[PDB]
């Protein structure tokens, strides 16, 4: 943005006088303009404009005329006011921005109300009355007093709507997520500015449909620039979000009002309304006395005398109001008349001519209150002031409008605070002290205008007067103001460098060009165009520069330079670009001026003392105009002695006055000198933010001592008490002296915990209070802490911190949460190595919380680190816990990574075979530096090799080398390839089936869920692709199956996943392969590919890899070099942090990859949609709509026609696609295809999909690194494995010379990523935590027969190797060979002791082990051992289909079904809709969930995508569990249960319930069909098999496509016929054997799977032949069989005695209902 720039001096261009500025050259007066020199003073009069008659037809609107829904909240009103009637149509029937200019007190309120009512009327909902959660309305009033006024009266009018209106304004650092539950926020501009600088601000503003600007003429005030920021900000977000927000502005009648209309985007023809003085509520005649000379006391007696004679044209009936500038003067000024109105011949005495108890009886009976009030009450007098008066204040308010109170002098505060208008008002003086300017100045234009808007009572008056006593000198300014003539200007130049910084920090402006555009949104721009001369711009300049391009560029340059000086922004004149600093970020967030930041940055240092920190606060530029006056020096000398902190060298300079002012505020010292009170209020109202700004500065630099000091200083200011004092002071219900009494003792607070109420009451010598003091001591927040540590490397430790609440919760005391800071400090407590925010929600109090983080360490190790957990609110509420390093064993240092040899890139011609080279010749000429260096050893060898390279490097083909070499040596070679993730498996299967079965014609196969059909693939295949649990369940029985033994090559991909969840299964199957290899003496080649590992040696030597053939490369040696940028966001609350990341994401795309492709990973499905729409809408507001679509819309339209997501079509048209799991596998393939072609430039994808994407970008942006766990009610970090994978996608070897990645994370995570991304990952094993299932299977298969075998098995593992390398990780406490053997033994012992207590194995002779029934079936079905433990524990003789689902949903395999956000509510809804209701059902229990999903699937209910996806994962393991249940019920001999369980198998398969009609298995049937079937007689599937074609579909609605599927169903539907016989039925006897032979045969050849469209897995027909005695409920014998065409089934048992035994024979499918035959019979 290089262009000629000129440094301005703002002090030259600024309107110095602020509000008091008059661009008003002249000034004209009305008709009556008489001037009367009573000569101590000039009186200028202007009379009341006659009432303006009703114009062109326009007439008042009786309330019943506006629509029915709006009537409400206008109670007590017969008719609309004239102004309100003029705009009822605009405010109610249109959504147009309005600018309503009217006289003060015109009643602009009810107009804003009609505007609200329109928005409220937009969420009707028929029966349900309001959609209170769907919208929000912000209302900006400009005074704190007015806001409270408004909340109450808007509160009233909208009760009948059930709408919540609440104040937000005040100093209170934002919290309340019940502001998430209020719809009308009422606040001040500066409050709303603070909120909306947050960036995650879009959590509040998300729903804001309408914002209202009361008293918008504040534009002109020194506070004006805040309004200009709000509106500029708001307007600009309307364009970026493209969601419409309505702006209503309400103003007084002042010049420039039409420039304000333009500012607010008001259509002049449609929504501009201006109403001159005619439209006053009550016509006011007005006097403007200015006065002639100095003469202080004389000038005031002048003034005080003026007041009497004016009131006394009102004797009996009339009310008066006087305004003064001091809560002291409410009485003093009413005294100078008390000393006059009655002092000269009791003039006008008896203002209440009820010298007869008319008004006095009600006035004298209310006298018994305090001060000047009881004093002034018995006659018509009263007072109202800002000097805290509370409940009596609200009682001078009723008795005034009840009309007993005659005279009431008051503070400006009342004009704003409550709507009580007098008949006349008089304004004494117009001079006020301003702490910020540090002088007296002329009181604000806003202020006056509100006061005279109180002359005359709307329902009770016909005229009103208004007298304004000011100084004659240069105060015809008030004539101007009060007669529609003082123009409204822009004060934006004053506040320009702070305003700019907030936008830079917000991400709204990244350079000067952006900033110049920003200025175009401000009121300044409009005003400079319209009156350029006034804003220092020559008519010549304007004429050649009509858009003020030179001025805005200059203004911004000048500001940028101030911010750069003060180190708030980094700004280079060259590019015009801006970079935010931390200092600037804090400045913006805490509302500190940039000069103050500089001072802080200059003064703050680790060794700053409390003395010096009180000093630094004093030097804050917000206080730079503060002087020490003479009349106050004595009192400051007095305060200095009573406060605690020494105030050095500073004698009474202003530095020291500010210093002691703060200390006296914390000490709650009383004051007198009102000049000093206004200064104290001004430094304390600020002190909160300034301290907290200093805290955040110092926290983030790591300064431990100063972080402690400042945090306490914050708490002390908030809590108004010293650290010295008693923490019991924080409980406001405790009487003061009771507490000073506990302080009077030299007794530590801590020791109160150990004292009972008696001993307390005793120590205090006030036994009355013993009990309640006790209550409060235990309400004090208190945490217990416990730490667990594990070394990771010699620099980093993983730390699990367990936080245990130990206090009583009272929501009156603690509310809905308590926040804490977790601080990890070094030995000396000088440095914070790590910190983070912990929010203890109330719902989850007294739950244990586990916070996990990593901390650095340095080899000359200290003895201790400390962990402090300090409250963020309560004083003296901390808890420390040392972390000893005395017995810590750091791991063995790692070797360097293998060198990268710059070899001349090997051509494809180095592969010699011509058939082979065709697979690569047409893709590239030369392999990458890793593939070539490796090639030597993997193509030209038969030995074991390990490749370690950053994901993306192209490891896949290194494995190919080996497979090519195998097909070169073997004809029908056998090769197994194992990837950890299933999603990777399918990706490699497509990739290779075409490369190896299409191209090279060898078989290539993919293992599935079923063992028998997989055993075949294992046989015919030359390349077998599999996930670990699949290869495990096969090769477990490697002794039996030969095919496992004769494999030539074994390829493991992503071996680093061994350290991941589900790593065990991989480590196991790998170790087994190595074991099998040494034992079969025909070595198996093992080839492992992995991410860069620090400890690759250990994985190499584990898998038999020499150091010659072990290739482990550093991340920086990646073929396509990566540019990592880690970007932190200090926002603890996740929903907010995600929102504040949205702008940075677009800036990331435009900076790092404007043309080239991008992938954004987001944490979830609905985030994927939201993030894409944002990129789009932001793209369109950047005026570059569709800059991501790199073809033409027509080019895409053939493809998009297929899709069904309306939104995916819309985003794709615009250049952005998204990938979540709710999309058809087709739709996903489309999006990826279009991305790889380059047609679309950006894909947003959910993190669950970083494994199943064969798509690469130029830039990868990870948007947050956390996801919610509904099981522990907390966000948890992405596995570093997922993040490593995501990053690997920023990699296009062919085109890009670089890849780029931007990770956006919470700050607390930042340092974690900086370590473990620029460096190699270390893996450990978690075998020891999953030891059982593998031993139990090894024992079943007699690979382990004794304890020594168990111990030797383990020598083959990775576990075995790492234990000695990092003992402390495994909880080994030494490293000798002895420690190893011990721990190994201790390990096998417990694992076998568990498996035996669990009834799976038998321990005999202490050394020998054997498989038991439970053990054998858990290995057979691959079910966790605790699962069958639970089955046998819970199944009984009487359990039915209902109880069965309950037990099976309790399987451990369902532990991992996750709970996600708001599924807590979703599952509760399911719960009321399913057939079976649960008792004590915990909705964050994965077992309660899989229960409901189980009944949901049976009911055929369709659900949300991630419930359906889970339903599939549940159904995945469903069948193997039921089968276990059969085995266990039969092995116990229970008949009716085992039958019940077989029904469940077939009814989970077909997706129907126990009493569901058998016809529900047939395609396209519904309840409507079945009812019109029982009416005929059709109740069976066989009852439609005998029917012929014409009668068949004559029954109900058919289509040619319906008949097709249905008739094909009945052709796979089992038509079996049975045959049985008792072998030697007559020569059978008691105790003896009985052999039963059952003959099965079907009249149909078997081709096709089991058809079960609702079951996500293709399964084959299993059958159960059973024999039982129904009378006793006895399972006699059973056999499970897959039948094909026909077969002989043999089952025997042992006869009981006495001949006659009646038996039953059962034939049971595990897949269909209605095939179940029964045959009765007898024997003996």
Curated annotation (Swiss-Prot):
ATP binds at residues 102-109, 949-956. Changing residue 686 to L: In RP33; strongly reduced RNA helicase activity. Its EC number is 3.6.4.13. It is an enzyme of class 3 (hydrolase). The modification Phosphotyrosine is found at residue 308. Keywords: Acetylation, ATP-binding, Coiled coil, Disease variant, Helicase, Hydrolase, Isopeptide bond, mRNA processing, mRNA splicing, Nucleotide-binding, Nucleus, Phosphoprotein, Repeat, Retinitis pigmentosa, Spliceosome, Ubl conjugation. It comes from the Eukaryota. Residues 881-1724 are annotated as: Interaction with TSSC4. One of its GO terms (biological process) is osteoblast differentiation. Widely expressed. The modification Phosphoserine is found at residue 1601. This is U5 small nuclear ribonucleoprotein 200 kDa helicase. It comes from Homo sapiens (Human). The chain holds residues 402 to 2125 of 2136 of the full protein.
């Amino acid at each position: 943005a290089l262009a000629p720039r000129q440094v301005l001096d703002l002090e030259d261009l600024v309107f110095t006088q602020g509000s008091h500025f008059m661009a008003n050259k002249r000034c004209q007066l009305p008709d009556g303009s008489f001037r009367r020199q009573r000569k101590g003073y000039e009186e200028v009069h202007v009379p009341a404009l006659k009432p303006k008659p009703f114009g062109s037809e326009e007439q008042l609107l009786p309330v019943e005329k506006l629509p029915k829904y709006a009537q409400a909240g206008f109670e007590g009103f017969k008719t609309l006011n004239r102004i309100q009637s003029k705009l009822y149509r605009a405010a109610l029937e249109t959504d147009e921005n309005l600018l309503l200019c009217a006289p003060t007190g015109a009643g602009k309120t009810n107009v804003a109300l009609m505007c609200m009512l329109r928005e409220i009327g937009k969420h009707i909902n028929m029966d349900g009355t309001i959609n209170v959660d769907d919208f929000k309305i912000i209302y900006i009033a400009p005074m704190r007093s007015l806001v409270q006024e408004m909340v109450g009266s808007f509160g009233k009018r909208l009760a009948t709507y059930g709408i919540t209106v609440a104040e937000l304004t005040g100093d209170h650092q934002l919290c309340k997520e019940e502001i998430s539950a209020t719809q009308i926020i009422v606040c001040t501009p500066e409050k709303w500015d603070i909120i909306t600088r947050k960036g995650g601000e879009r959590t509040y503003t998300q729903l804001v449909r309408l914002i209202i600007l009361d008293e918008i003429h504040l534009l002109h005030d020194d506070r004006g620039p805040v309004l200009e920021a709000l509106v500029a900000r708001a307007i600009r977000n309307i364009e970026m979000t493209q969601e419409d927000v309505r702006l209503i502005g309400l103003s007084a009648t002042l010049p420039n009002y039409e420039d304000v209309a333009t500012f607010l985007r008001v259509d002049p023809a449609k929504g501009l309304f201006y109403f001159d003085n005619s439209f006053r509520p009550v016509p006011l005649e007005q006097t403007y006395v200015g006065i002639t000379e100095k003469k202080a006391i004389k000038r005031f007696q002048i003034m005080n005398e003026i007041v009497y004679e004016k009131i006394m044209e009102h004797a009996g009936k009339n009310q008066v109001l006087v305004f003064v500038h001091s809560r002291k003067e409410t009485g003093k000024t009413a005294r100078a008349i008390r000393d006059m109105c009655l002092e000269k011949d009791t003039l006008g005495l008896f203002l209440r001519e009820g010298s007869a108890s008319t008004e006095v009886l009600r006035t004298e009976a209310e006298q018994c209150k305090n001060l000047e009030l009881k004093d002034l009450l018995p006659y018509g007098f009263a007072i109202h002031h800002a000097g805290m008066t509370r409940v009596d204040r609200t009682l001078v308010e009723d008795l005034f409008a009840d009309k007993h109170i005659q005279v009431l002098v008051s503070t400006a505060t009342l004009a704003w605070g409550v709507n009580l208008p007098a008949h006349t008002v008089i304004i004494k003086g117009t001079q006020v002290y301003s702490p910020e300017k540090g002088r007296w100045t002329e009181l604000g234009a806003l202020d006056i205008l509100q006061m005279l808007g109180r002359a005359g009572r709307p329902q009770y008056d016909t005229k009103g007067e208004g007298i304004l006593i000011t100084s004659h000198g240069e105060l015809q300014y008030y004539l101007s103001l009060l007669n529609q003539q003082l123009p409204i200007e822009s004060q934006m130049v004053s506040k320009l460098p702070d305003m700019l910084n907030a936008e830079i920090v917000l991400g709204n402006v990244q350079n000067a060009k952006d900033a110049v555009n920003w200025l175009g949104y401000a009121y300044l721009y409009i005003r400079m165009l319209r009156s350029p001369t006034l804003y220092g711009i020559s008519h010549d300049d304007l004429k050649g520069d009509p858009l003020l391009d030179q001025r805005r560029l200059d203004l911004v340059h000048t500001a940028a330079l101030m911010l750069d000086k003060n180190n708030l922004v980094k700004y280079d004149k060259k590019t015009g670009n801006f970079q935010v600093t931390e200092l600037g970020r804090i400045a913006s967030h805490y509302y500190i001026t940039n000069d103050t930041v500089q001072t802080y940055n200059q003064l703050l240092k680790p060794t700053l003392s409390e003395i010096e920190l009180f000093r630094v606060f004093s030097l804050s530029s917000e206080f730079k105009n503060i002087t020490v006056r003479e009349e106050e020096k004595l009192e400051l000398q007095k305060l200095l002695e009573r406060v605690p902190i020494p105030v050095k060298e500073s004698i009474e300079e202003p530095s020291a006055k500010i210093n002691v002012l703060l200390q006296a505020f914390i000490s709650q010292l009383k004051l007198e000198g009102f000049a000093l009170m206004a200064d104290m209020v001004y430094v304390t109202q600020s002190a909160g933010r300034l301290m907290r700004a200093i805290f955040e500065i110092v926290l983030n630099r790591g300064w431990a001592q100063l972080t402690d000091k400042t945090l306490n200083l914050c708490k002390m200011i908030d809590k108004r008490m010293w650290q010295s004092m008693c923490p019991l002071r924080q409980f406001r219900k405790l009487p003061e002296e009771v507490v000073k009494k506990i302080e009077k003792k030299n007794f530590p607070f801590e020791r109160l915990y150990d004292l009972n109420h008696n001993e307390i009451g005793e120590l205090i010598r006030m036994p009355k209070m013993g009990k309640t003091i006790h209550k409060y001591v235990h309400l004090f927040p208190k945490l217990e802490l416990s730490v667990h540590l594990q070394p990771i490397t010699r620099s980093t430790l993983k730390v699990e911190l367990t936080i245990t609440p130990d206090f009583q919760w009272d929501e009156k005391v603690h509310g809905s949460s308590e926040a804490f800071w977790i601080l990890v400090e070094d030995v000396d407590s000088e440095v914070i190595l790590h910190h983070e925010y912990f929010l203890l929600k109330a719902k989850y109090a007294q739950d244990e919380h586990l916070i996990t983080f990593f901390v650095p360490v340095f080899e000359p190790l200290p003895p201790q680190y400390f962990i402090r957990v300090v409250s963020d609110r309560w004083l003296s509420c901390e808890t420390q816990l040392p972390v000893s390093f005395r017995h810590l064993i750091l791991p063995e240092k790692y070797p360097p990574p293998t060198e990268l040899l710059d070899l001349q890139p090997l051509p494809v011609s180095a592969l010699r075979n011509s058939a082979f080279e065709s697979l690569y010749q047409d893709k590239f000429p030369f392999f990458n530096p890793i593939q070539t260096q490796v090639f030597n050893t993997v193509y030209n060898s038969d030995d074991n090799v390990f490749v370690g390279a950053p994901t993306g490097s192209g490891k896949t083909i290194c494995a190919e080398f080996a497979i090519l070499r195998m097909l070169l040596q073997s004809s029908e070679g056998r090769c197994v390839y194992i990837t950890p993730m299933e999603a990777l498996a399918e990706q490699v299967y497509m990739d290779w089936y075409e490369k190896f079965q299409d191209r090279l014609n060898k078989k290539v196969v993919l293992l599935t869920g079923e063992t028998s059909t997989d055993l075949k693939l294992l046989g015919k295949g030359n390349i077998i692709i599999s996930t670990p649990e699949k290869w495990d369940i096969l090769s477990r029985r490697w002794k039996q199956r030969k095919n496992v033994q004769n494999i030539n090559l074994f390829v493991v991909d992503e071996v680093h996943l061994i350290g991941g969840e589900n790593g065990p299964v991989l480590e196991v199957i790998c170790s087994r392969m190595r074991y099998i290899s040494s034992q079969i003496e025909r070595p198996i080649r093992i080839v492992a590919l992995s991410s860069s590992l620090s400890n690759a040696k250990d994985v190499a030597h584990w898998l038999g890899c020499s150091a010659t053939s072990t290739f482990n490369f550093h991340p920086n040696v990646r073929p396509v070099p990566l540019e990592l940028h880690i970007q932190g966001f200090n926002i603890s609350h996740t929903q907010t942090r995600l929102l504040s990341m949205a702008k940075p994401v677009y800036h990331a795309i435009t900076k790092h990859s404007p043309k080239k492709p991008v992938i954004v990973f987001v944490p979830s499905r609905k985030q994927t949609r939201l993030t894409a729409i944002d990129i789009l809408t932001t793209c369109a507001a950047d005026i570059q709509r569709q800059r991501f679509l790199h073809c033409t819309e027509k080019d895409l339209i053939p493809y998009l026609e297929k899709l069904s997501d309306s939104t995916l079509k819309e985003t794709l048209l615009n250049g952005v696609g998204y990938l979540h799991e709710g999309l058809s596998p087709m739709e996903r393939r489309l999006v990826e295809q279009l991305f790889s072609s380059g047609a679309i430039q950006v894909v947003v994808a959910s993190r669950s999909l970083c494994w199943g994407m064969n798509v690469a970008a130029h830039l990868v942006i990870i948007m947050d690194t956390q996801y919610y766990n509904g099981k522990i009610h907390a966000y948890v970090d992405y596995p570093i494995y997922d993040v490593l994978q995501m990053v690997g996608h920023a990699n296009r070897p062919l085109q890009d010379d670089e890849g780029r990645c931007v990770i956006m994370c919470q700050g607390s995570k930042k340092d974690f990523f900086k370590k473990f991304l620029y460096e190699p990952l270390p893996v450990e094993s978690h075998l020891d935590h999953c030891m059982h299932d593998h031993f139990n299977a090894e024992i079943v298969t007699k690979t382990i027969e004794n304890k020594q075998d168990a111990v030797d098995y383990l020598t083959w593992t990775f576990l075995y190797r790492r234990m000695t390398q990092n003992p402390n990780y495994y909880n080994l406490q030494g490293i000798s060979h002895r420690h190893l053997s011990d721990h190994l033994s201790e390990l096998v012992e417990q694992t076998l002791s568990d498996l035996e207590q669990s009834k799976c194995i038998s321990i005999e002779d202490e050394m020998d082990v054997a498989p038991l029934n439970l053990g054998m079936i858990a290995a057979y079905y691959y079910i966790n051992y605790t699962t069958i433990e639970l089955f046998s524990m819970s199944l009984n003789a009487k359990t039915k289909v209902r109880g069965l689902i309950e037990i099976i949903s309790n399987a451990a395999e369902y532990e991992n079904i996750p709970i996600r956000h708001h599924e807590d509510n979703l599952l509760r809804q399911l719960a009321q809709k399913v057939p079976h209701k649960l008792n004590n059902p915990k909705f964050n229990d994965p077992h309660v969930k899989t229960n409901l999903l189980l009944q949901a699937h049976l009911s055929r209910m369709q659900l949300s995508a991630e419930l359906q996806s889970d339903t599939e994962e549940i159904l995945s393991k469903a069948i193997r569990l039921i089968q276990a249940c059969v085995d266990v019920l039969s092995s116990n001999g229970w008949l009716s249960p085992a039958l019940a369980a077989m029904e469940l198998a077939q009814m989970v398969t077909q997706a129907m319930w126990s009493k569901d009609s058998y016809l529900k298995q047939l395609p396209h049937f519904t309840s409507e069909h079945i009812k019109r079937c029982t009416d005929k007689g059709v109740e069976s599937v066989f009852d439609i098999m005998e029917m012929e074609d014409e009668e068949r579909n004559a029954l109900l609605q058919l289509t040619d496509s319906q008949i097709a599927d249905v008739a094909r169903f009945c052709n796979r539907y089992p038509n079996i016929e049975l045959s049985y016989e008792v072998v030697d039925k007559d020569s059978i006897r008691s105790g003896g054997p009985v052999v039963v032979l059952v003959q099965l045969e079907r009249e149909e050849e078997v081709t096709g799977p089991v058809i079960a469209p609702l079951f996500p897995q293709k399964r084959e027909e299993g059958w159960w032949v059973v024999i039982g005695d129904a009378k006793s409920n006895s399972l006699i014998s059973i056999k499970r069989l897959t039948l094909q065409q026909k077969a002989k089934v043999k089952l025997d048992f042992v006869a009981p005695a006495t001949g006659a035994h009646n038996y039953t024979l059962y034939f049971m499918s595990d897949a269909y209902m209605g095939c179940d035959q029964e045959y009765k019979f007898s024997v003996d």
